[PDB]
Design a protein around this ligand. Structure first.
Ligand SMILES: [Cl-]
Ligand SMILES: [Cl-]
Ligand SMILES: [Cl-]
Ligand SMILES: [Cl-]
Ligand SMILES: [Cl-]
Ligand SMILES: [Cl-]
Ligand SMILES: [Cl-]
Ligand SMILES: [K+]
Ligand SMILES: [Mg+2]
Ligand SMILES: [Mg+2]
Ligand SMILES: [Mg+2]
Ligand SMILES: [Mg+2]
Ligand SMILES: [Mg+2]
Ligand SMILES: [Mg+2]
Ligand SMILES: [Mg+2]
Ligand SMILES: [Mg+2]
Ligand SMILES: [Mg+2]
Ligand SMILES: [Mg+2]
Ligand SMILES: [Mg+2]
Ligand SMILES: [Mg+2]
Ligand SMILES: [Mg+2]
Ligand SMILES: [Mg+2]
Ligand SMILES: [Mg+2]
Ligand SMILES: [Mg+2]
Ligand SMILES: [Mg+2]
Ligand SMILES: [Mg+2]
Ligand SMILES: [Mg+2]
Ligand SMILES: [Mg+2]
Ligand SMILES: [Mg+2]
Ligand SMILES: [Mg+2]
Ligand SMILES: [Mg+2]
Ligand SMILES: [Mg+2]
Ligand SMILES: [Mg+2]
Ligand code: NA
Ligand code: NA
Ligand code: NA
Ligand code: NA
Ligand code: NA
Ligand code: NA
Ligand code: NA
Ligand code: NA
Ligand code: NA
Ligand code: NA
Ligand code: NA
Ligand code: NA
Ligand code: NA
Ligand code: NA
Ligand code: NA
Ligand code: NA
Ligand code: NA
Ligand code: NA
Ligand code: NA
Ligand code: NA
Ligand code: NA
Lengths: 156, 142, 337, 172, 132
RNA sequence: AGCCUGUGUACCAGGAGGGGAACAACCCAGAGAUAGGUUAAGGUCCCCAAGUGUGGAUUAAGUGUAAUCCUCUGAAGGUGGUCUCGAGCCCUAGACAGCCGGGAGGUGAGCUUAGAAGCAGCUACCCUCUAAGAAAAGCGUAACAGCUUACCGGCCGAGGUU
RNA sequence: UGUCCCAACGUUGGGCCCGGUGAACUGUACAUUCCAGUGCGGAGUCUGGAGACACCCAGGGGGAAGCGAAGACCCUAUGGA
RNA sequence: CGAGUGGCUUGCUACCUCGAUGUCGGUUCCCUCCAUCCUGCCCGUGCAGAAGCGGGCAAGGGUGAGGUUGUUCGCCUAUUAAAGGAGGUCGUGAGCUGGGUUUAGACCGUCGUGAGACAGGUCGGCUGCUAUCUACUGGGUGUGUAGGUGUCUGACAAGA
RNA sequence: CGCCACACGGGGUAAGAGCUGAACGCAUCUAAGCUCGAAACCCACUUGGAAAAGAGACACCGCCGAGGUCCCGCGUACAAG
C-alpha cells in the first residue's frame, strides 16, 4: 500500500497498547549501528534532517536504514563509525478493509511521527564522509525532502 | 483599392499586438486606418512555440468552421478584430474602417506609432509575420 | 473487439455536388521546360475498342511481343486559339491583365460569345509588353474553343470555350509564340502539341447518375443476413455517436453522384491519326461513325460518349516517353453483339 | 565589456550593419554577428566587440565573436586545411571530385554512388588515398570535411567490423 | 513473387474443397490460407492460379488425411486473362502438394497445368505431363 | 470524496446592488423613491470606464498574465539555465587551464615464480643526483616495450579554486 | 443454396410531380448553430470564442437526456389484495 | 522503499434523473487519444552476418479470416509487415439483432412444515411513433455585391 | 467477378548524427550561428470555392435594345426545380 495513505499527521495520536491489540511487529532491525561499543568520540557528526512533519511507516524506516547502513560498508563490516536512527514507530495505523458502515479500521501497521527539522538519523565519522552518501540514498526512501546536516566538522 | 485613410500606420519592425491595440482604439474613435507592410510586422518570443500556436489555429475546425487566416494580411486583421466588439454595430463599423496591406500601396510612408517599435539590435527572439505565413504554407505573394 | 477497416470512399473529391461547368477546368499546368507551346487540347469522346500493340516496355520480359490493349477513341479535330490572355502578378495572386484577339472567327462562335467587332490588338500587346518590362507579367494563356460542327456524331454546334496555358522557353519568346498562333487564326491541332506515345492527363465531367444511395455513392455495405429482411436493406447503421450531437459531413449519405469533374492522370496516347480506321462496324453505340482527326487513349476516360474531354501533358509522369508504339491491329468489330 | 582585435597587416576588414567581411591574399569571408546589445565595429587598425552588459550569456557570445573573427583573419591568410584518408577492407572505394560535390563509388560494394555537395569556396584536392579540404571560411571547410566523413556513415551493421569510409586525419 | 504473366480472378476461398492433382495419396484438399495474403474486414481470404496456399487433406490415404500441408494452385474454373486478351478456364479446381523448397511431394502430376504456373514453380512445371 | 457525523461562528436558504468570464453561500456591500458627488472590492494595452504611469531588479519558459476553489494541479528527485549574498584557501616571488620541455638513475628493489622488470600476489618503501621525479596514481604487455598522473622548469598574464 | 465473400441487374406496388379529398401526434416561451467552459455534477437559450444572407425541395434519422406511459426494478406508507 | 500520472476495471459516496435519459453482447457507420503492434527515421547491445532484444521520435496509413462460448474477456488454428490498446451516455435499439441478464408457463438440484425461495442450472417466452426544431448529405428560389455574354482569379476548405 | 489511372521531388523539423563555438584560455552538437535528418509537417497533385461585406479580375456586346425567360423537338442532364 502507498504512503499516500499514511504520511499525513492529520489523525489523533493512536499509541495506547492497553486499548489496541494485534499490532504488527516492526520491520526495523536495529537502531544502533556500527561500533556501538564506542561512544560518540568522533571528529565529524552528520545528521539527516526531515524538512516536513510527516509519518514514516516502519516499512520506510527499515528500507531507509538498510540502504544507508548497507552502504556504509564502503568502510567495512567492522568499520570505525556509529549510526543512529533516533525515532521509533509509535503511531499505530489502520485500514478499513460493509462499506463506510462500522468503518473504524483494523490495525495494519506502525509509523513514526517526525516534525520538520528533527534529525531522524545521526552518524559519527572521522574525516571520511561516505556517510553523506549513505544518506543521499536514505532520504530517497522516505517521503519528505531532506537536509543533510553536519555538526562537529569545520574540516572543510 | 483606394482607401481614404485618416491614418496610415507602418507595421515594419513593430509589435503586432501593440499596434493592433492602438489601431483598435483609434477605429472606435471614428478613424479610418490602414496598416502597411504587414508582412514585416513582428512578434516577440521563441519562434518554435509561436508557430505552434498559429499552426494549431489552422488545424482547429469542423463543419461549423474555424476559418483562420494564413497570410500576414489576415493574421494581422484578425488580431485587430479580437480587440473590437466586431459583432456589435459600432464594433463592425470600426473594424470595417480598418484595412491591412502587404507592403505599401500608398505614396506616403506610414507613421510609426509610439511604443510599438522593436529594436533589432537588442532583440534576437522574435519572428516576422511573413515568416509565420511561410511556415503555415501561405503563398509568398510579397 | 471490432476489427479496423478503411472508411467508405475518399474524402478528397468533395463536396460530391453537380459540376459547375460541363467543360473541365485544369487547376494545374506542366512546367516550363522545352520550347514554347500550348499546354493542352480538347476532343469529344466516341467509344471504345481494343488494339494489338508491340510490347514497348524495355523492362518487360515480354518487350517485343503482341499485346491487347483497351483504347477509348476520342475525336480530336483542330481547335482555334482565338486570343492571348495575359496575367499580372499581384499581392493577391494572378489577375487577368489584357487580351489580344483576332478578326477571323469561326462562323458559329457567336452561339456562345458576343464576338468582338472592335478591338485594339496592339494596345493590348503594348500593355502586356510594358508589364513584362516592369516584370509583373504572370504566365501566358490562350482562349481556345472547339469546332463541334466538324464532328457530325456530336449534336452541338455551339463551341466549347476554355483557357489553356502556354509554357515555353523565355517569357519573351513564348509571348511572341503566343501572338503568332493567335494572329493567324489560332488554328492548331493535336499533332502540334502531343506525339503518340507520350503521357497526358485527361480531365472530364463524369457520367451523371442523378441521386444515388450510400451503397453505390460511397461503397458502404448492404445490411447483411437477418438484418437485410427487417425493413432496412441499403441504409447505414447510424449517422454517428450520441456525442457529438450533430451529423458529421464525413458520414456517407445519399446525394448527387456522377457529373463531377475528374482529372485522370498519366493516360498514354497510343496513337494520333485521321480517318475511319478506328471506327466500329455498325457505328459506335449511341455515338456514330468516326472519320476524321482522332486520338486513341489507352484505357478509359471520364465522361460519357459525346462529352468534351481535355488533354494536358502529364504533370507528374512515372515513366519516360516511348514514342510511336507499333500498332499491329485495331479492332473494328461491331460493339453490338 | 570590450575586446580589441588588432587586424593583421596582411588583412583588411570592413563592416556595415551586422555583417563583417575579411579579405586577405587567400580570399574573403563575410559573417553575420548578431546578438542582443553586442556592437562589432572596425576602428581603423582594430576590430572592436563591445557591450554594456556583463551577464554570462553576453560574455559567452563576445568570446564566440572573437574566435570567429580571428578564425577569419587566419582563413584569409594562412588558410584552413583538413586532412582526410579514404580506407576500405574488401571493396576498393573510389572517391572523386565531380563538379561542386565529391562523389564516392563502390562503397561496401554499393551500386549507387554516394555524394555530397561542397560548401562555399572550399577546395577538395584528392591524391591517392589522401584528401585535403581547404579554404578561407572555416565554417564551410569544416562542414565539407565533416560531410565527407558522414557520407560513409553506417548504422545497420557493426562499425567495429565494417570500418570502411573516409576520415578526418588532421584538424587545423 | 514473380509476375504470373496473366491476370487472375481468384476462384477459391478459405474453406474451398479442391482436387489434388498428383499421386501423393491425397485426393481432396481443403484450403486453409493463402501465402503472403491479407484481406480486409469481412472478406473471405481468396486464392487462385499460381498462389501457394496452406491446405489440409480431406480425402485420401489414412496417413495423408488430416495432415496440414502446403500446395500450389494449378487449375481453376474461374477465368484468367492472358496478355493477348484471351481468357482461359479449366474443367476443375486443382492444386499440387509442395514442400519447403516447392518441390512436388509426389512423383507424378495428374491432369493439365497452366503455363503461368511455370514462371513461378519450376520443379512443379518440370513434372507436368501437359502444360497448356 | 462535490463522503459520513459533531462543534463554534458567519452566511445561503429568505439577501438585492458592485466585483469574480459565467456561478446559492469567495471579496465589497446589507437596500424606500429621485438627484448630484466620493469611495469600497476590484481594476486602469484593446475588447472595457481609468496608465501602453514612475524609480529599480529578475525571468526567456509565452514560465507567467490563475486570491479562495470538485473547479486554479503538479511531486519525490534532479539542474555549470541564470541572477544575488557569504565564507575558506591559492595568486604579478606569476596562480587556474592549456601548450612545449623534463619526468633521471642504485634499479629490471626483495620476495615468491620458468616468469614478473611501478602496476598477479606478499613485504617494504629506503638514498642519490637535482630545479623536478612514487620502491609508482591509471592504462597497456605472456612478461618487456609503449602511453600517461603525480612531481619540476618554460611560454602566457589575471584572477582562480573550494 | 445470394446466409456470407460482394454485391449487380431486372419485375410489380409505392416513393417523386399534377387534379380532388383530407386527419392525427405534438406545442411555456424564444430558437441559424458549433467548440469549450460553467451550472443541481448530462446546456440551442448562462460565459468566452467561433461560425452564421433569407426562403424552399428531397433524404437517411446525430441531438432536442425527441414523442408515447404520474417506473414494472428498488425503497418508503403504522397502503391494498 | 519512496514520489506520481491516467480515469479503461473494481470498490466507495449518494450530487443528478424514479409524472422512465430503453439492458449486456454483437452489428453497422463516423471522429478521436497514444502509454506504438506493423510501417518510416534513429540510439544501445551480452551489435560479425542473418535473426533478435531493449530504447527514442512518431498517430500518415494499416492492424485481417476462422473453431468452442450469448459472452465482453479469453482459449485455440492457419495466414500476416503486424494481425496494439483505449475514448466518444461502458459512441451507436425515433439503425438493426434479441443469443444472455430480468415478467407471466415448466423441469432438476438445494433450502423451507408450507406459500415459495436461490448472486444455482435448464426449455419457451413481444422490440411502438406519419420529424415541429436543430444537424448534416445533395437539389432549388430569391436578395446583396450593382445591364449582358464568355473566360478567369483564389481568401480559404477537403483528401491517405 | 472485368479494364484503366492514383509519383517523384523540393522546403522546414523531431529523435538522432555532426560542424564552428563561448561561457570555463582546454573541452563541449548549443548558449548565439550552421550542416543534415522521419511513413509525421508545409509545398507539390486532385476536388470545392465571388456571399472572400476589401462581396474580385479580364475581353467583348449592349443601355432601345445585348442578353435572357416562356415556347417547340430532344437528352451527354434529371425525384420537383
Ligand atoms: Cl474549419
Ligand atoms: Cl461583439
Ligand atoms: Cl532576444
Ligand atoms: Cl447489417
Ligand atoms: Cl487465412
Ligand atoms: Cl440587513
Ligand atoms: Cl502565446
Ligand atoms: K429513475
Ligand atoms: Mg424485425
Ligand atoms: Mg457490345
Ligand atoms: Mg463477342
Ligand atoms: Mg544484423
Ligand atoms: Mg465479420
Ligand atoms: Mg426554503
Ligand atoms: Mg477607455
Ligand atoms: Mg501556461
Ligand atoms: Mg492554490
Ligand atoms: Mg454565444
Ligand atoms: Mg411514479
Ligand atoms: Mg416487486
Ligand atoms: Mg394484505
Ligand atoms: Mg433517448
Ligand atoms: Mg510518445
Ligand atoms: Mg489519424
Ligand atoms: Mg453504450
Ligand atoms: Mg465502440
Ligand atoms: Mg439512437
Ligand atoms: Mg426501439
Ligand atoms: Mg421509427
Ligand atoms: Mg432471449
Ligand atoms: Mg437460450
Ligand atoms: Mg432462454
Ligand atoms: Mg441587407
Ligand atoms: Na453490513
Ligand atoms: Na524524499
Ligand atoms: Na508576443
Ligand atoms: Na482553422
Ligand atoms: Na420494418
Ligand atoms: Na422486410
Ligand atoms: Na441513444
Ligand atoms: Na442573512
Ligand atoms: Na458577476
Ligand atoms: Na501562456
Ligand atoms: Na436475391
Ligand atoms: Na434525429
Ligand atoms: Na422525469
Ligand atoms: Na450493444
Ligand atoms: Na500511426
Ligand atoms: Na472466438
Ligand atoms: Na445511455
Ligand atoms: Na428495438
Ligand atoms: Na443493443
Ligand atoms: Na523532409
Ligand atoms: Na460577387
Amino acid at each position: 500500500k502507498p504512503g499516500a495513505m499514511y504520511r499525513n499527521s492529520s489523525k489523533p495520536a493512536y499509541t495506547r497498547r492497553e486499548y489496541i491489540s494485534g499490532i504488527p511487529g516492526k520491520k526495523i532491525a536495529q537502531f544502533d549501528m556500527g561500533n556501538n561499543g564506542a561512544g560518540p568520540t568522533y571528529p565529524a557528526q552528520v545528521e539527516l534532517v526531515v524538512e516536513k512533519p510527516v509519518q514514516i511507516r516502519h516499512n520506510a524506516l527499515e528500507a531507509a536504514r538498510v540502504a544507508a547502513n548497507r552502504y556504509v560498508q564502503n568502510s567495512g563490516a567492522a568499520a570505525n563509525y556509529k549510526f543512529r536512527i533516533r525515532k521509533f514507530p509509535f503511531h499505530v495505523i489502520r485500514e478499513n478493509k460493509d462499506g463506510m458502515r462500522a468503518p473504524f479500521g483494523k490495525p495494519v501497521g506502525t509509523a513514526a511521527r517526525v516534525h520538520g527539522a528533527n534529525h531522524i538519523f545521526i552518524a559519527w565519522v572521522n574525516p571520511d564522509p561516505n556517510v553523506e552518501e549513505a544518506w543521499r540514498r536514505a532520504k530517497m526512501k522516505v517521503t519528505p525532502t531532506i537536509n543533510i546536516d553536519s555538526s562537529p566538522a569545520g574540516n572543510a | 483599392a483606394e482607401f481614404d485613410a485618416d491614418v496610415i500606420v507602418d507595421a515594419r519592425d513593430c509589435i503586432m499586438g501593440r499596434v493592433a491595440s492602438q489601431v483598435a482604439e483609434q477605429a472606435l474613435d471614428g478613424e479610418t486606418v490602414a496598416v502597411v507592410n504587414a508582412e514585416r510586422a513582428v512578434i516577440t518570443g521563441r519562434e518554435e512555440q509561436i508557430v505552434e500556436k498559429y499552426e494549431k489555429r489552422v488545424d482547429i475546425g469542423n463543419d461549423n468552421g474555424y476559418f483562420y487566416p494564413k497570410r500576414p494580411d489576415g493574421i494581422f486583421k484578425r488580431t485587430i478584430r479580437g480587440m473590437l466588439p466586431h459583432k456589435k454595430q459600432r464594433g463592425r463599423e470600426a473594424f470595417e474602417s480598418v484595412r491591412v496591406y502587404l507592403g505599401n500601396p500608398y505614396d506616403e510612408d506610414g507613421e510609426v506609432l509610439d511604443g510599438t517599435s522593436l529594436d533589432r539590435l537588442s532583440n534576437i527572439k522574435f519572428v516576422t509575420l511573413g515568416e509565420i505565413s511561410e511556415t503555415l504554407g501561405a503563398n509568398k505573394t510579397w | 473487439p471490432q476489427p479496423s477497416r478503411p472508411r467508405k470512399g475518399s474524402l478528397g473529391f468533395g463536396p460530391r455536388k453537380r459540376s459547375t461547368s460541363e467543360t473541365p477546368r485544369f487547376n494545374s499546368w506542366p512546367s516550363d521546360d522545352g520550347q514554347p507551346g500550348v499546354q493542352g487540347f480538347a476532343g469529344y469522346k466516341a467509344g471504345m475498342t481494343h488494339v494489338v500493340l508491340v510490347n514497348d516496355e524495355p523492362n518487360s520480359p515480354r518487350e517485343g511481343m503482341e499485346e491487347t490493349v483497351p483504347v477509348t477513341v476520342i475525336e480530336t479535330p483542330p481547335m482555334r486559339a482565338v486570343a492571348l490572355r495575359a496575367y499580372e502578378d499581384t499581392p493577391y495572386g494572378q489577375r487577368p491583365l489584357t487580351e489580344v484577339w483576332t478578326d477571323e472567327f469561326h462562323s458559329e462562335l457567336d452561339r456562345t460569345l458576343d464576338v468582338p467587332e472592335d478591338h485594339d490588338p496592339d494596345a493590348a500587346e503594348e500593355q502586356i509588353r510594358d508589364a513584362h518590362e516592369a516584370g509583373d507579367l504572370g504566365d501566358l494563356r490562350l482562349i481556345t474553343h472547339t469546332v463541334p460542327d466538324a464532328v457530325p456524331s456530336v449534336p452541338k454546334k455551339k463551341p466549347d470555350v476554355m483557357e489553356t496555358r502556354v509554357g515555353g522557353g523565355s517569357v519573351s519568346d513564348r509571348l511572341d509564340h503566343a501572338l503568332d498562333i493567335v494572329e493567324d487564326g489560332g488554328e492548331h491541332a493535336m499533332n502540334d502539341i502531343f506525339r503518340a506515345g507520350e503521357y497526358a492527363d485527361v480531365a472530364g465531367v463524369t457520367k451523371g447518375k442523378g441521386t444515388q444511395g450510400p451503397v453505390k455513392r460511397w461503397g458502404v455495405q448492404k445490411r447483411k443476413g437477418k438484418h437485410a429482411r427487417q425493413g432496412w436493406r441499403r441504409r447505414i447503421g447510424n449517422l454517428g455517436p450520441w456525442n457529438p450531437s450533430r451529423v458529421r459531413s464525413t458520414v456517407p449519405q445519399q446525394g448527387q453522384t456522377g457529373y463531377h469533374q475528374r482529372t485522370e492522370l498519366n493516360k498514354r496516347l497510343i496513337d494520333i491519326g485521321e480517318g475511319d480506321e478506328p471506327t466500329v462496324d455498325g457505328g459506335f453505340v449511341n455515338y456514330g461513325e468516326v472519320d476524321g482527326p482522332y486520338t486513341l487513349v489507352k484505357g478509359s476516360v471520364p465522361g460519357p460518349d459525346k462529352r468534351l474531354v481535355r488533354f494536358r501533358p502529364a504533370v507528374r509522369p512515372n515513366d519516360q516517353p516511348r514514342l510511336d508504339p507499333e500498332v499491329r491491329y485495331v479492332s473494328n468489330e461491331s460493339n453490338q453483339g | 565589456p570590450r575586446v580589441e582585435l588588432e587586424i593583421p597587416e596582411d588583412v583588411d576588414a570592413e563592416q556595415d550593419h551586422l555583417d563583417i567581411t575579411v579579405e586577405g591574399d587567400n580570399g574573403s569571408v563575410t559573417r553575420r554577428l548578431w546578438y542582443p546589445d553586442i556592437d562589432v565595429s572596425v576602428d581603423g587598425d582594430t576590430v572592436v566587440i563591445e557591450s554594456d552588459e556583463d551577464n554570462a550569456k553576453t560574455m559567452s557570445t563576445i568570446g564566440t565573436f572573437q574566435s570567429h573573427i580571428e578564425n577569419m583573419f587566419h582563413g584569409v591568410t594562412e588558410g584552413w586545411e583538413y586532412g582526410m584518408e579514404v580506407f576500405y577492407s574488401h571493396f576498393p572505394m573510389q572517391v572523386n571530385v565531380e563538379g561542386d560535390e565529391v562523389v564516392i563509388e563502390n562503397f561496401l560494394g554499393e551500386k549507387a554512388p554516394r555524394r555530397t555537395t561542397i560548401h562555399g569556396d572550399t577546395d577538395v584536392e584528392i591524391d591517392g588515398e589522401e584528401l585535403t579540404v581547404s579554404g578561407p571560411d572555416i565554417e564551410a571547410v569544416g562542414q565539407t570535411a565533416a560531410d565527407i566523413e558522414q557520407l560513409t556513415r553506417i548504422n545497420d551493421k557493426d562499425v567495429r567490423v565494417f570500418q570502411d569510409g573516409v576520415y578526418i586525419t588532421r584538424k587545423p | 513473387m514473380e509476375a504470373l504473366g496473366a491476370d487472375v480472378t481468384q476462384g477459391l476461398e478459405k474453406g474451398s474443397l479442391i482436387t489434388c492433382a498428383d499421386n501423393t495419396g491425397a485426393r481432396e484438399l481443403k484450403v486453409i490460407s493463402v501465402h503472403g495474403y491479407s484481406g480486409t474486414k469481412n472478406r473471405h481470404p481468396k486464392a487462385g492460379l499460381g498462389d501457394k496456399i496452406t491446405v489440409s487433406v480431406t480425402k485420401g490415404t489414412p496417413e495423408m488425411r488430416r495432415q496440414v500441408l502446403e500446395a500450389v494452385v494449378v487449375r481453376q474454373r474461374k477465368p484468367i486473362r492472358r496478355p493477348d486478351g484471351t481468357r482461359v478456364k479449366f474443367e476443375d479446381n486443382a492444386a499440387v502438394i509442395v514442400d519447403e523448397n516447392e518441390d512436388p511431394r509426389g512423383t507424378e502430376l495428374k491432369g493439365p497445368i497452366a503455363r503461368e504456373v511455370a514462371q513461378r514453380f519450376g520443379s512443379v512445371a518440370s513434372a507436368a505431363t501437359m502444360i497448356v
